[PDB]
């Protein structure tokens, strides 16, 4: 996998170039904001079971046929498998936020997942809707202004969002 | 490619778990040093051509046969010297990447892994590159913790060659 | 999905062999009980709505907070009560399947496997469903070996919840 | 896998329904005939090597090029592999008869078998003819009226037949 | 399929290495015998029909029931005798291949592997083919090391049948 | 795998025939030349690292973009992997020369290799050029007239060449 720093390095090495002054300053800027990054990872990580539970509730309210008999989340084994996938995707998302790069999420979670779901008959469209509900629950938790030093985490929340959206696009 | 951040994610992922407070503190540690190391990488870029020639000259002094003996693997030709300074530019560039990444990952993945095989197959002596690294170490012109880091990467490369 | 018949085939198949006289006798055993158990499943079908309400009422008595406390996971609403009676209908329906199949297979595959995860994630108390099962056990109105079987399936479900 | 009873259960569960009175009576009827079922499994099982040997003889009389040099059952290793496949298919068939459902035979034996044979160059058409010869030998043995309480096993023999025919269609 | 040459390559390949001086000497050994063995294979070809009948006749003497008892697996018919002489022609032809290849490989791959299964399933007695081989051994009409080799292959086949 | 002798045997067995007098004489002729064969295997084997080193030098002189930054042999790990492939292919070639048949080289080395390289992004065309450079270095070494009893190895060198060319065609 790559993190934000080795991502920049690998693109440079491919051109045989040193990292430019501009790219270095871009990474410094990311270093300056890194407490905020680590808060988001901490907050999402520590509220993982709540984000999964609430997203699942909202998905099934929106899509009740998923868990009526004959639905693909009906029966405890399939419901549990569904919740487990939601947790797994949330975990890879927290890894992308921490490293500041999507590659861990792409390489170890999303690549091949669409194909896995179609071979199984899992409705990818509904998985995508579940991921979006986790996005909303997760960003509300990560960007909560209580119990934290006050400041602007706008770009960071957009970044978090883009990792959830990548997961939605990989299966939807 | 190993950095403090990737090491933590790889531990967490191999155990199927979310990142710990400790792995978060790893990140703080990495981020506390980062800006002085990023600065170090910029100064190495502005002095790269200068350092690379200086280093290659220091190699031609210490090992005079490399300038005179003919054959593919020596700097007895315009092309031989240009290969040599190129290789030195690679060690320098890849070292600057270690300052950017906060660890030896770029050194391991781009240079060290397979190095012995390369040097053996193309009849290049490791001692040559050890001298070049010694020259780089004595002329980068860095100070503070930037120097101590840069020097750890240079030492790590010398050790792989020995 | 485990029934006496499938257990025998899975043993024979894992050993690469044809079925034994013993596995044939397993089938006779299964077939000797089957008709009284099939009858039991039919009577459970004709009393399902009745049993499910009766059971859900018994849960609302024992745990009065479930009718009054607001929030998703409680029967304080038309929708909450309807979710509750639905879940009870599932335990009852899946129990009738065990009578049809001659074993716990339907209970394991449709309800028990993952049950803890479901109850934890959706904040449903296992004790609720334990009471509902107790009510079902005391009102199915079955006799003979049909009762002893039905009751084994009910006990097996209570035990998974405890 | 499914047996006859869980097959009926799974179709019901998919609709969220109890097994109907009619479906229950259909299974009772199958329970009433179950001694006959178990005789067929016993008789085929206990005469397995004879059914395989005789079917192989009849296949090769009909198709002598299979075992002339350059044929796909020529050489002892290939002949043995062929006999082994015949035995394996007969064994899965006995399992389907015992459970009263094809799923064990489909899931563990027939699925993917056509593809296995084409990758190998085994002539699927001739495997199908071999299976049909086993069907004939097997039904003669299962429906032999000697040494058994007298009665009607017509529907059961048609069922046995349909499992052999499923094997023939999966590779032919 | 095992010959001295293939055995050496398979050892070298399983150890990820180039062939040794020893494996080269294996080849010299194989090549030193080859021409006399190739000659032996040619003489077996010119006498094959003769040997096969002679052998099959010797089997019908030793085991007279094979000519008289009716049933698929016996030589009581034109077709039964023709099957029998065919099988004997296979042992003879496959033996000639062992002389060509310098080892038992053709015997293992074409005849011996699965032989017991074939003989059991088709109710053919191994003792029949043992007699036929004994006749072949006493009439091939070979001399020198060719005979000793041919006879090793015949003995190896008799041993697989016993 | 097959060697030259079992190759002839397997073609005969497929027709139900004895090896012909002509085919036997063809193998005798190969037996008569076998010292030369074994010299070639010995000489290539004992000069393996020189053949690889020199072929690699010549390939990169001809194709310098392979090892400039962003090239597929740039970085020590990829350069080492490239040299290793060259060695591996040379090793299977020596096995084909020793046995006198391509099957070992086809079965254990070349089959599936084109597909492996395209999935990786390795430029098969350039691998083929590397193999050709090994061919030239190898035949010069195998056919060196110094330190050896004098005679004609023309057909043998053409055979060696055809194994290198098979490797080039399998990936190029
Ligand atoms: C946007 C995400 C929200 C927000 C973030 C924010 N955080 C800080 C400051 C800090 N954050 C931390 C983080 C942690 N400390 C810990 O002990 C742990 C567990 C290991 C974590 C994750 C730390 C140490 C600081 C500095 C000390 C402090 O608490 O102040 C800021 C201030 C600026 C900065 O980058 O330092 C901001 C803005 N702020 C909001 O209002 C958002 C809702
Ligand atoms: C059609 C398949 C043939 C046939 C079948 C048939 N069988 C029975 C009765 C029984 N079959 C058994 C079976 C076994 N007993 C054993 O000990 C074993 C080994 C474990 C087996 C497989 C048994 C116990 C009975 C009852 C006792 C008896 O032997 O009579 C019937 C009678 C009706 C019934 O279903 O019970 C029939 C019709 N009958 C034929 O004529 C067909 C050729
Ligand atoms: C073409 C390849 C070159 C060539 C070959 C050639 N070789 C020989 C003779 C022999 N070669 C060997 C080989 C070895 N001896 C060993 O100890 C080892 C290591 C195990 C090997 C590989 C041997 C024993 C002989 C015979 C003894 C001898 O050295 O003379 C000949 C002569 C004819 C023959 O086939 O025997 C030839 C022609 N000759 C050339 O000029 C080519 C460049
Ligand atoms: C829940 C929102 C949705 C849903 C999910 C569902 N998933 C499965 C089964 C599998 N899901 C995966 C996915 C992963 N495995 C991994 O290791 C990783 C990380 C790399 C992922 C992302 C896999 C491999 C399976 C199959 C194997 C297994 O079950 O462990 C099911 C079960 C399908 C079945 O028919 O059994 C379900 C139900 N279901 C929904 O309806 C939601 C939209
Ligand atoms: C300078 C200190 C001495 C010197 C150098 C010289 N080097 C080469 C050839 C190669 N060097 C490498 C090294 C690398 N490749 C990489 O990808 C990396 C990591 C990024 C390194 C460090 C390689 C692969 C080659 C060969 C392939 C190529 O041509 O690029 C030569 C030419 C060798 C030859 O045999 O032609 C020379 C002359 N020479 C001296 O005498 C100096 C003391
Ligand atoms: C009645 C005893 C109590 C009660 C029930 C109640 N349950 C739910 C929600 C769910 N129940 C399940 C259970 C199953 N799903 C299955 O597939 C199977 C096996 C066939 C079982 C047993 C599941 C998955 C849900 C959630 C998904 C869904 O909505 O269907 C609720 C709603 C929970 C919520 O958070 O919205 C309620 C209210 N409530 C009481 O208070 C009674 C004591
Ligand atoms: C005999 C009627 C026909 C015939 C058969 C034949 N089959 C093979 C090789 C294989 N057959 C299988 C099939 C199975 N393996 C299993 O485990 C199962 C149960 C799930 C089945 C149904 C497989 C996997 C192989 C290959 C692996 C192996 O040999 O064990 C051969 C050999 C082919 C070869 O070229 O080696 C033959 C000859 N041949 C005929 O001509 C008849 C029509
Ligand atoms: C002669 C010594 C006796 C004899 C022979 C006889 N054999 C058969 C049938 C078969 N023999 C084989 C043997 C082989 N198949 C091979 O591929 C190889 C290796 C190349 C061998 C050795 C096989 C497979 C058969 C059956 C298939 C076929 O028909 O070819 C028969 C007919 C058996 C039957 O049941 O129909 C006979 C009569 N019979 C004697 O009585 C002699 C003493
Ligand atoms: C050198 C002339 C060219 C070149 C080569 C190159 N190859 C690889 C990677 C692999 N090559 C193989 C091939 C084999 N593996 C085997 O076991 C065998 C014998 C059966 C062969 C022929 C495989 C499997 C790999 C991948 C796994 C591994 O690395 O061990 C690379 C690395 C590609 C990468 O992106 O990492 C390279 C660079 N490169 C060139 O440019 C030359 C034309």
Confirm or reject: Cβ of C92 under 6 Å from ligand 6: no
Q: Which atom of ligand 3 is nearest to the CA of F34?
A: 35
How far apart are the CA of D36 and the centre of ligand 2, in A? Answer: 5
Q: Which atom of ligand 3 is nearest to the CA of F32?
A: 35
Distance between CA E40 and CA E143 in Å, rounded? 9
Residues within 6 Å of ligand 7 by CB = D 66, 72-73, 78, 81-82, 85-86, 88, 108-109, 113, 116, 120, 122-123, 126-127, 130
Question: How far, rounded to the nearest angstrom, does the alpha carbon of residue C95 sit from its chain's CA centroid?
Answer: 3
Ligand closest to the CA atom of residue A119 = 4
Looking at the 3D structure of chain D, how many domains does it have? 1
> Looking at chain F from residue 1 to 40, which residues have their Cβ under 8 Å from any Cβ of chain D?
13-16
In the reported structure, the alpha carbon of residue E145 is separated from the centroid of ligand 3 by a whole-number distance in angstroms of: 26
Task: Please state, in angstroms and rounded to a whole number, the distance separating the CA atoms of residues C32 and A125.
Answer: 48
As given in the structure block, the two tokens for residue C2 are: 């485990």
What residue's CA is closest to ligand 3, atom 27? F149
Find out whether D106 is annotated in a ligand binding site: no
Q: Determine the Cα–Cα distance for residues E66 and E68; give it in Å rounded to an integer.
A: 6
What's the CA-to-centroid distance between A28 and ligand 1, angstroms?
Answer: 17
- Residue B153 contacts residue B95 (beta carbons within 8 Å): yes
Which atom of ligand 8 lies at the shortest distance from residue E118's CA? 24
Smallest CA-to-CA distance from F40 within F127, F155, F172, F130 is with F155
What is the b/e burial string over D28-64, where b = at least 16 CB atoms within 10 angstroms of the residue's CB? eebbeebebbbbbbbbbbebbeebbbbbbbbbbeebe
3-class SS at F1?
coil
* Interface touch C113/A83, C-beta < 8 Å: no
Ligand at minimal distance from the CA of A154 is 1
- Using the Cβ of D80 and the Cβ atoms of chain F, whether some distance falls under 8 Å is answered with no
| Cα within 13 Å of Cα(C54), Cβ side | 14
Residue whose pair of structure tokens reads 């060719």 in the numeric block = E146
Q: Nearest residue of D to residue F10 by CA position?
A: D70
Identify which of F52, F72, F114 to mutate to test ligand 9's pocket (most ligand atoms within 8 A of the CB).
F72
CA C125 to chain centre: 17
Calculate how close chain B gets to A32, using CA atoms only, in Å: 8
Distance CA C100, CA D9 (A): 7
Burial class (CB in 10 A: 0-12, 13-18, 19+), E52: buried
- 10 Å CB burial of residue D114 (0-12, 13-18, 19+) is middle
Tokens representing residue A65 in the block: 């046929």
* Shortest Cα distance, chain D CAs vs residue C161, angstroms: 22
What's the gap in Å between F144 CA and the centre of ligand 5?
30
Measured distance CA(F2)–CA(C71) in Å, rounded? 75
F66 Cβ below 6 A of ligand 9 = yes
| Nearest Cα residue to atom 34 of ligand 1 | A35
Compute the distance between CA of residue C57 and CA of residue F169 in angstroms, rounded to an integer: 79
Q: Where do we find the tokens 């693909």?
A: A72
Residues on chain F touching B111 (C-beta within 8 angstroms): 75-76
Distance between CA B133 and CA B94 in Å, rounded? 12
Residue A30 contacts residue A99 (beta carbons within 8 Å): no
In the DSSP assignment, the letter for residue F64 is G
Helix intervals (H) in F33-123 = 34-46, 48-62, 76-99, 103-105, 113-120
Q: Whose CA is nearest to atom 9 of ligand 7?
A: D81
CA distances from B70 to B80, C54, E32, E81, F52 (A): 10, 100, 48, 81, 21
**Atom 34 of ligand 2: nearest residue by CA position:** D35
Contact of D68 with chain F, judged by CB distance below 8 Å, is answered with yes
Of the CA atoms within 13 Å of residue B95, those in its CB half-sphere come to 30
Minimum Cα–Cα distance from D4: chain C residue: C101
- Identify which of A69, A114, A120 to mutate to test ligand 4's pocket (most ligand atoms within 8 A of the CB): A120
Count of C-beta atoms within a 10 Å radius of residue B162: 8
Can you read off the two tokens belonging to residue A112?
């091949």
CA atoms within 13 Å, Cβ hemisphere of B89: 18
Q: How far apart are CA A76 and CA F76, in angstroms?
A: 52
Which subunits count as partners of chain B given 3+ CB pairs below 8 Å?
A: A, F
**CATH number of residue F109's parent domain:** 1.10.490.20
C14 lies in which domain range?
A: 1-162
D–C contact (≥3 CB pairs within 8 Å)? Answer: yes
Strand, helix or coil at F68? Answer: coil
Residues 6 or more apart whose CB falls under 8 angstroms from that of C38 comprise: C99, C100, D24, D27, D28, D31
> Of A52, A85, A88, A126, which is best to mutate to test ligand 4, by the most ligand atoms within 8 angstroms of its C-beta?
A85
Residue with tokens 């190896």: E156
Which residues make Cβ contacts (< 8 Å) with residue F146, sequence separation at least 6?
none
Partner-chain contact C121 A76, CB within 8 Å: no
Q: How many Cα atoms occupy the beta-carbon half-sphere of D44 within 13 Å?
A: 34
Please write down the HEC assignment for all residues of chain A: CCCHHHHHHHHHHHHCCCCCHHHHHHHHHHHHCHHHHHHHHHHHHHCHHHHHHHHHHHHHHHCHHHCCCCCCCCCHHHHHHHHHHHHHHHHHHHHHHHHCCCHHHHHHHHCCHHHHHHHHCCCHHHHHHHHHHHHHHHHHHHCCCCCCCCCCCHHHHHHHHHHHHHHHHHHC
In the structure, do chain E and chain B come into contact, i.e. share 3 or more CB pairs under 8 Å?
Answer: no
Structural domains of chain C, count: 1
Instruction: Tell me if F77 and B121 make a contact (CB, 8 A cut-off).
Output: no
Q: Which string of b and e fits A88-106 if b means at least 16 CB within 10 Å?
A: ebbbbbbbbbbbbbbbbbb
- Whether A69 contacts A75, CB under 8 Å: no
Closest by CA to A42, choosing from A88, A89, A112, A98, is A98
DSSP annotation string for chain E: ---HHHHHHHHHHHTT-PPPHHHHHHHHHHHHHHHHHHHHHHHHHHTHHHHHHHHHHHHHHH-THHHHS-STTSSSSHHHHHHHHHHHHHHHHHHHHHHHHTSSHHHIIIIITTHHHHHHHTT--HHHHHHHHHHHHHHS---HHHHHHHHHHHHHHHHHH-
Any idea what the CATH number is for the domain that residue C100 is in? 1.10.490.20
| Chain-chain contact of A77 with C110 (C-beta, under 8 angstroms) | yes
Q: CA C140, CA D151: separation in Å to the nearest integer? A: 39
- Integer-rounded Cα Rg, in Å, for chain F is 18
Domain extent at residue F136: 1-172
- Longest Cα pair distance anywhere in chain C, in angstroms? 60
Q: Resolution limit in angstroms?
A: 2.1
* Among the partner residues E9, E94, E101, nearest to F104 by beta-carbon distance: E9
- The set of residues, in sequence order, having a beta carbon less than 8 Å from that of F41 and lying 6+ positions away, is E19, E24, F94, F97, F98
Q: How far is the CA of D39 from the centre of ligand 2 (A)?
A: 6
Closest alpha carbon within chain E to D49: E121
Q: Decide whether any atom of ligand 8 lies within 6 Å of the E75 Cβ.
A: yes
In whole angstroms, give the CA distance from residue F78 to residue F82. 6
């Amino acid at each position: 996998m790559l993190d934000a720093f080795t991502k920049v390095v690998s693109q440079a090495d491919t051109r045989g170039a040193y990292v430019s002054d501009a790219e270095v300053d871009a990474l410094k800027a990311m270093v300056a904001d890194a407490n905020k990054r680590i808060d988001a990872v901490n907050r999402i990580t520590g509220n993982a079971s709540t984000i999964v539970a609430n997203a699942a509730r909202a998905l099934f309210a929106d899509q009740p046929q998923l868990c009526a008999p004959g639905g693909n989340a009906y029966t405890s084994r399939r419901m549990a498998a569904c919740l487990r996938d939601m947790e797994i995707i949330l975990r890879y998302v927290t890894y992308a936020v921490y490293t500041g790069d999507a590659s861990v999420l792409n390489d170890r979670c999303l690549n091949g997942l669409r194909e896995t779901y179609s071979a199984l008959g899992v409705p990818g469209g509904s998985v995508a809707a579940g991921v979006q509900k986790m996005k909303e629950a997760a960003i509300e938790i990560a960007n909560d202004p209580k119990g934290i030093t006050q400041g602007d985490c706008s770009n960071l929340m957009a970044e978090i969002g883009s990792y959830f959206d990548l997961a939605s696009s990989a299966v939807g | 490619m190993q950095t403090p951040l990737i090491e933590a994610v790889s531990s967490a992922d191999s155990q199927g778990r979310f990142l710990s407070s400790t792995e978060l503190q790893v990140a703080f540690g990495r981020f506390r040093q980062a800006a002085a190391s990023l600065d170090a990488a910029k100064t190495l870029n502005s002095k790269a051509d200068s350092l690379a020639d200086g280093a290659a000259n220091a190699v031609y002094q210490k090992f005079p046969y490399t300038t005179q003996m003919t054959g593919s693997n020596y700097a007895s030709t315009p092309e031989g010297k240009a290969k040599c300074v190129r290789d030195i530019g690679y060690y320098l560039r890849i070292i600057s990447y270690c300052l950017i990444a906060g660890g030896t990952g770029p050194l391991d993945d781009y240079l060290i892994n397979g190095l012995a095989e390369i040097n053996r197959t193309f009849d290049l002596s490791p001692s040559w590159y050890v001298e070049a690294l010694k020259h780089i170490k004595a002329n980068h012109g860095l100070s503070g913790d930037s120097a101590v880091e840069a020097n750890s990467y240079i030492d790590y490369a010398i050790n792989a060659l020995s």
